[PDB]
Design a protein around this ligand. Structure first.
Ligand SMILES: *[C@@H](C)/C=N/c1c(NCCCCCO)[nH]c(=O)[nH]c1=O
Lengths: 98, 244, 265, 201
């Protein structure tokens, strides 16, 4: 039974400029089976109002999802995406690298 | 290995009466269907059940409801029968949904006649007529005729019995009844049948011939108020013996 | 038109954790979800407004019934596979069917199945046969290929019906599906040159780096085409700078018939 | 809307070939079915076509042209048991079956030695009816319904005496009117010139 671990990418909707409202995206893809937990983090805390697409299907039989929240980036605040999956020993955290 | 079993084969109803048709299949099929068949048109779906646990309306659901009781059974309900529901009803089933190349497997059919008043219902008179001596001498064959006349509705089964056994070889029964008054919408019906045997068989005086008609009519709970006898489901027959 | 596709997926899970559906089915046109059904809602629902606006309730009602039947069928098939495999625990079964209408007018059609996320049975609509990946699949192949009419039916659906559905949905969604939003492209250093594009639709885009007019694909890092969330997409590509010799690097982007070149001075 | 058309009735001779046509106009196409339905019985599946061409199953073949929206069911070496209605049905884009109204196929038996005659059956002591049998005529003969409201005439019926491999056509006429006689019972039909009328009384 081949289980495939999620690829996790964190990026803003538009090129980010401080003080300008944006969307922070976390795109989780390529994983199998389908159960998965995704949080967006701000300064290490879970953001509460976070939207996401319905589970999506790829031709190679893996799945993908987009998690996103509106935000205004500042020089001080650090953002991340935290993902758990059956293929991960502990939750994996990927920081937004602007 | 029964296939699709539906009941009843025949039923007379008064306007407003309730009725349930039963259907079961033992083929482990998932989809079941109720159709009605009427002269001059294609089958029309009343209700169907794509799988156990769901049902939905077909093309002509008004006046009907269904229940997919389990995987095997799919019943059709006429809560308040109307004359327009006079028809032949067919249950059918398929392995999987309507989707794909799978064919339908049909039950034997249920003939319903819905009437405003049961005073139009009549059992048949049955009479048997012995062969013409001229036919015997010209052909060495002998044709007996059975006439079942004056019945309504067309819910009859006619059979011939020779020497205590039902026969079908040598038999021809009209495939459709004759309207005795072709202009009336509720005309009573006539039906003829012939049995043809060799002259030698007819000339054996121990050979015995009977025509029997099963009529499907009223039952105990139907209300009857006419002066004549209540036209219940019944068998009417007539006989003849061979003659030397 | 550009190339377009219609595809329908099914997912079945044999022993799902609490809440999670035993069965899900989703349709797509290109990258756009158009329909959804699962064993919890037991209803087929639009996932694109241009689908809801153009298909009357009788459409959703009819396919809701078919999907309830397809759900049960998928459960039976998965139960059978897990017996043949002699597997315990939760396992997945998947189906994908669909067709493409290519720019040049030609068509493709495909149908395949997967068990635990790996190819299981693949239909060949030209030879009218199923490719099996192991012996459990081989047993299913034998049963399916014994039903020659069903193979013919699938060929007709893939080649005629699927293409007709796709053309119907392409017209319904033409304001979304047939529009063009050109990319905004920039280059920056982070030591490697990054070529970044954003704001573009459709998502199909080609970005590469050239060095003195020659393409070295083996030393290029290609980023994924990713959804930005507003209906448009973004992408990137990087190449590493040689610190001992100057070179003329240029980013090349092709999108919807337009080519762009960004020369790095 | 959607519709499917097939002839109401066809008549052919035993041993011959008949082609039953079905044309359809539908919203999408997911295959075409033929069913056989003997009178008073359930329809039974005969054939399925979904790609173009001709498929064979015994004495029956079914053809489909998707571009012309046409199919035919072809019956070779017709036998009396092929007398039945034949129903076409098409699955549309949503897998709804659209049913044709059916084609009734009537088969004329090959009457080897026609011996047309009208016989008076013997009276029944339980009936006031006089009964006449028109029998053993060739299959081109048609039996007309009666024109007197108190005379009843049934359509012709084909009887098979299997033990002798002998088939014969017959029709029955009856009445309780005093002026009814077998010599005039079938006067409204066109009956063979050599029809035998045995003497009465
Ligand atoms: C509404 C149209 C949803 N359809 C759907 C389908 N349709 C495809 C039927 C193909 C027949 C040949 O196999 N498939 C599916 O898996 N999920 C759906 O939601």
């Amino acid at each position: 039974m081949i289980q495939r671990t999620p690829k996790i990418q964190v990026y803003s909707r538009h090129p980010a400029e401080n003080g300008k409202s944006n969307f922070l995206n976390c795109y989780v893809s390529g994983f199998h089976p389908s159960d998965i937990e995704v949080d967006l983090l701000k300064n290490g805390e879970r953001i509460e109002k976070v939207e996401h697409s319905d589970l999506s299907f790829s031709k190679d039989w893996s799945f993908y999802l987009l998690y996103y929240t509106e935000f205004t980036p500042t020089e001080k605040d650090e953002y991340a995406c935290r993902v758990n999956h059956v293929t991960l020993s502990q939750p994996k955290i990927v920081k937004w690298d602007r | 290995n029964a296939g699709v079993t539906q009941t009843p084969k025949f039923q007379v109803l008064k306007t407003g009466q309730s009725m349930t048709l039963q259907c079961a299949q033992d083929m482990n099929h998932n989809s079941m269907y109720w159709y009605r068949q009427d002269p001059g048109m294609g089958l029309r779906l009343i209700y169907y059940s794509a799988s156990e646990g769901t049902t939905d309306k077909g093309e002509v659901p008004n006046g009907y409801n269904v229940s997919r009781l389990n995987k095997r059974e799919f019943s059709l309900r006429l809560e308040s029968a109307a004359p327009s529901q006079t028809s032949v009803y067919f249950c059918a089933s398929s392995v999987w949904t309507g989707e794909g190349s799978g064919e339908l497997f049909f039950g034997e059919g249920s003939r319903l006649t819905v009437l405003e008043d049961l005073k139009n219902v009549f059992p048949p008179e049955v009479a048997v007529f012995e062969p013409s001596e001229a036919e015997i001498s010209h052909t060495q064959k002998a044709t007996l005729v059975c006439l079942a006349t004056g019945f309504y509705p067309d819910h009859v089964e006619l059979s011939w019995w020779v020497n205590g056994k039902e026969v079908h070889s040598g038999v021809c029964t009209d495939p459709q009844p004759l309207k005795e008054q072709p202009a009336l919408n509720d005309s009573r019906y006539a039906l003829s049948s012939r049995l043809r045997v060799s002259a030698t068989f007819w000339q054996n005086p121990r050979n015995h011939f009977r025509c029997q008609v099963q009529f499907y009519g009223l039952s105990e709970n139907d209300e009857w108020t006419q002066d004549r006898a209540k036209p219940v489901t019944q068998i009417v027959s007539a006989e003849a013996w061979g003659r030397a | 038109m550009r190339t377009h596709s219609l595809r329908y997926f099914r997912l079945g899970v044999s022993d799902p954790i609490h809440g999670v559906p035993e069965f899900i089915s989703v349709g797509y046109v290109d990258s756009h979800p158009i329909t959804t059904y699962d064993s919890v809602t037991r209803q087929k629902e639009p996932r694109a407004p241009w689908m809801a606006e153009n298909l009357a309730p009788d459409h959703w009602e009819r396919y809701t019934q078919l999907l309830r039947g397809w759900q049960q069928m998928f459960k039976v098939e998965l139960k059978r596979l897990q017996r043949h495999y002699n597997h315990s625990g939760s396992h997945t079964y998947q189906r994908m069917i669909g067709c493409e209408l290519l720019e040049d007018g030609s068509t493709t059609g495909f149908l395949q199945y997967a068990y635990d996320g790996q190819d299981f049975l693949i239909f060949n609509k030209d030879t009218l046969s199923w490719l099996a990946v192991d012996n459990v699949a081989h047993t299913i192949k034998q049963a399916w290929e014994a039903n020659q009419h069903e193979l013919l039916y699938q060929k007709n659906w893939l080649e005629e019906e699927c293409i007709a559905w796709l053309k119907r949905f392409l017209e319904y969604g033409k304001d979304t599906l047939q529009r063009t939003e050109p990319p905004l492209v920039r280059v920056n250093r982070k030591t490697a040159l990054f070529c970044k594009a954003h704001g573009f639709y459709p998502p199909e885009i080609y970005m590469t780096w050239m060095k003195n007019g020659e393409e070295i694909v083996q030393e290029i890092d290609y980023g994924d085409i990713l959804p930005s969330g507003d209906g448009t997409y973004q992408a990137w590509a990087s190449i590493e700078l040689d610190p001992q010799s100057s070179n003329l690097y240029s980013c090349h982007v092709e999108h919807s018939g337009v080519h762009m070149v960004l020369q790095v001075p | 809307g959607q519709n499917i058309d097939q002839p109401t009735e066809m008549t052919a001779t035993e041993g011959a070939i008949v082609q039953i046509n079905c044309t359809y106009q539908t919203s999408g196409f997911n295959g075409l079915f033929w069913y056989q339905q003997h009178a008073g019985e359930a329809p039974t599946f005969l054939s399925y076509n979904v790609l173009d061409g001709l498929e064979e199953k015994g004495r029956f073949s079914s053809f489909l042209s998707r571009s012309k929206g046409y199919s035919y069911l072809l019956l070779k070496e017709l036998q009396m048991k092929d007398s039945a209605s034949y129903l076409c049905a098409v699955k549309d884009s949503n897998y709804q079956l659209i049913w044709g109204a059916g084609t009734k196929l009537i088969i004329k038996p090959d009457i080897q030695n026609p011996d047309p005659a009208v016989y008076q059956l013997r009276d029944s002591k339980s009936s006031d009816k006089s009964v006449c049998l028109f029998t053993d005529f060739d299959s081109q003969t048609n039996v007309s319904q009666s024109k007197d409201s108190d005379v009843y005439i049934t359509d012709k019926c084909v009887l098979d005496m299997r033990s002798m491999d002998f088939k014969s056509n017959s029709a029955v006429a009856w009445s309780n009117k005093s002026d009814f006689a077998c010599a005039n019972a079938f006067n409204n039909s066109i009956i063979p010139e050599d029809t035998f009328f045995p003497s009465p009384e």
